Amino acid sequence: MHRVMGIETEYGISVPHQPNANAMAASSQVVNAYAARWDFEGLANVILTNGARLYVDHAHPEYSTPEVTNPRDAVLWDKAGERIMAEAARRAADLPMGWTIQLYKNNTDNKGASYGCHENYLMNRSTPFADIVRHLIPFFVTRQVFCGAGRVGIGADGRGEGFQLSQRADFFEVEVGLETTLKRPIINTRDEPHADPEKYRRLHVIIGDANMSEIATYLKLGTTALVLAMIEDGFLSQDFSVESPVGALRAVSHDPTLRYQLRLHDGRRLTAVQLQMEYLEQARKYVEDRFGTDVDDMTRDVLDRWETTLVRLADDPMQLSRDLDWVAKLSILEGYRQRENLPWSAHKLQLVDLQYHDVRPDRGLYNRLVARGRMNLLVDEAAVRTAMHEPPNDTRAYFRGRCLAKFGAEIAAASWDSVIFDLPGRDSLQRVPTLEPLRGTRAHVGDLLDRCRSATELVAALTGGENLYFQ
Template sequence: MSVRRVMGTEVEYGISVAGQPQANPMVASSQVVNAYATSTLKARRARWDFEEESPLRDARGFDMSRQVADPSQLTDEDLGLANVILTNGARLYVDHAHPEFSCPEVTNPLDAVRWDKAGEQVMLDASRAAARLPGNPQIHLYKNNTDNKGVSYGAHENYLMRRSTAFADIVKHLIPFFVSRQVFAGAGRVGIGQERPKHGFQISQRADFFEVEVGLETTLKRPIINTRDEPHADPEKYRRLHVILGDANLAEVSTYLKVGSTSLVLAMIEDGYITRDLSVDGPVSALRAVSHDPTLKTLITLKDGRKLTGVQLQMEYLDLAKKFVEERYGSDADYQTKNVLERWESVLDRLERDPMECATELDWVAKYKLLLGYRDRDSLEWDDPKLHLIDLQYADIRPEKGLYQRLVRSGRIERLLTDDLVEKAMHEPPTDTRAYFRGRCLEKYSENVAAASWDSVIFDLPGRESLQRVPTIDPLRGTKKHVGGLLDSSETALDLFNRLTGS
């Protein structure tokens, strides 16, 4: 295996209404999603199909009772909130109190970055569309993970894995990796603690909000390893690893390394390659300890007695990954696999030497450098409200306001993509997963698509008394290679369905 696998991101955006601090975030989020749908989807809006979802199925071999589940876990219930499917295969919807963009399925880290960045632009257009409605105030969106009032919201990753991989092995080998991955994947945060009771700066926006090692929950007692067993694919072949630990990244290199390194570690776990025990003593406290030290000097204790910094623990995984790729592929490794390894090594070397050397690549370092500049210039302490405002402004997705956006315009942040590629990804699906079929059907036959989900498209066809479901259970079918010609030559949804079913 390499960095290539079916993967994707899903990001909940922070939201505020200008001049209305008490505004209902669910109402504001619905306005954002509905405004985008109205301005871009001219025809019938397909509903989301919840039938195949199973959010309470646990990878440890049981189903949680609906009676004891927190309402936030019941993602298979249609609450009547705004929920649309886009022509790029993505889902744009209201997840309780936040607008969320769930990327279409992709097969490699660079595409994960591309459609994640497309999500930022969709959200920007959505907030602008909402502001144009008569009587509506300005609604501001932030790609961050906390309101700094004790509330955290997610930036999740999804990776398809072989079902045959023992879940205990996933837990054992991923926990130390996730504890230390934040050294390059953190988004940075002013304040320490869930309600920032201590003053200072930390690496991760999410670390303080995790309380247990393993669990099914996503909003209460958040676990480092989430056990939701909802593959959205053939359950006999696949499991979907639902990662809730990560930060919402703006820096393209941070996202690229986050998903690329994780994919490589998953490949090693699937192949049984990791025989070295890197287990951490007290992972939850270690997660927070690493985050709370932007000097990256804090030592965490491994169960074998060794003491390593977060960077050094990442170097252990990097060393294994380099050997793994060399043994499996040698010089035949694909470009992205080699590039992830090279960037991973380069970033870790520089973080160990001086984190500030990564200020053009990593979110937390870029933000930290900005904040230190303001502190030095204006003699500010970490509890100064100005620094909290700068933290928030970094994540503002408006190009004229966001500090990350200003860094990009001034050439102080490295990019991996062009604006043109991101613009196209706002409207076009990936060509090498089933998202291509879903997106093209929404684009070409929108009047006849009644509903869709990750693993089906449901048509409302003339002359048929009932709705017709087309399963898309294999994420690697329904690609441009498989169905591009069929879609191009089928003038109507009925033509397509008849040819698909041999009717």
């Protein structure tokens, strides 16, 4: 099983003791200090040689992975984004302005502002949206039991005291809608696949916290992809719908003892962990029914880790302190509460909540846990460093990233669905559409790119071959 997917992360940005600084200028310094331009057809907005987008969005620097086909690669190129952000801030410190810029891979300032970590999944256009909604809402209400990054403060304005599973939960207000910045919906309806809209839907998911833990990001993307396969195939016969799902999202988040019971329309009363176990059981039956034991290793691994995590959550969540963000964070928080007799209103607990997500290797608390061997990893650092500058081989990001690496000077602009060349001795720009996400791969264009010594040679060889290499 594969599925085209990508992750967009808006980073928190802080520039203390700089009265000239504003969020837009600081975000631009980050984007510009790291590094062709984006093809909208005015903010700092670049495509990287790994096929990712790095740009200023809503006064935050944002990193959007290249298109990938599986959740391990999603983790890998998303983690590369953290390294890119850290390096970009270090390079911005060398700009004439000399600002010390701090970046946070989180989702709130604990004072009423939230910013987004969006997941994108490619789906069949034919899948009816009412089934997408009714099967995903209960899954999204409950997957925070392993996806949550943890938060100190209850309520969007942070005025209630205590710890909760997720940063995003208090900001959601409706079940379905177009919004992403206010009155946020559990299911966002925007459908912009940057691909053939007769074939594909792009599902745009906005409810997840950004995760530091690679295991959490892996489960977030991998379990969702399995549930989408069941929805596409019409496999789910049960009704998982719950009463008052927005209220249930908040109540689940606000109970880190994991005992709150959802009230299902069919009469059942299940905790969030129990409802997740129902989705896991169906996913196991789905994979057995479709493939037998001919299951690909990554699908088997996602199922095994999903089940193991849910079993441990129902047994004792604190045994997952090396795997899940909210557990790792809560373990530090409770350590200080015990050592220093701190109430939940203590400012030191707020600082731990935020600094956990600092991208600096020397100062971010998640990064310190990794350095001390107190966090389980999924990928190794050498591969993360390579993914900062090399694209995935099995999507159209391959063509995009390799063109920029090899012919960057002659790339006028690029986007998810095109690369635009500026060739010497030509008054017109050459737009190469890359409309299919699973074409333009190394298997399609790698040898061609190897043997072309100039962008003029490449565009010549691609001419009239659009319906071979890219669609």
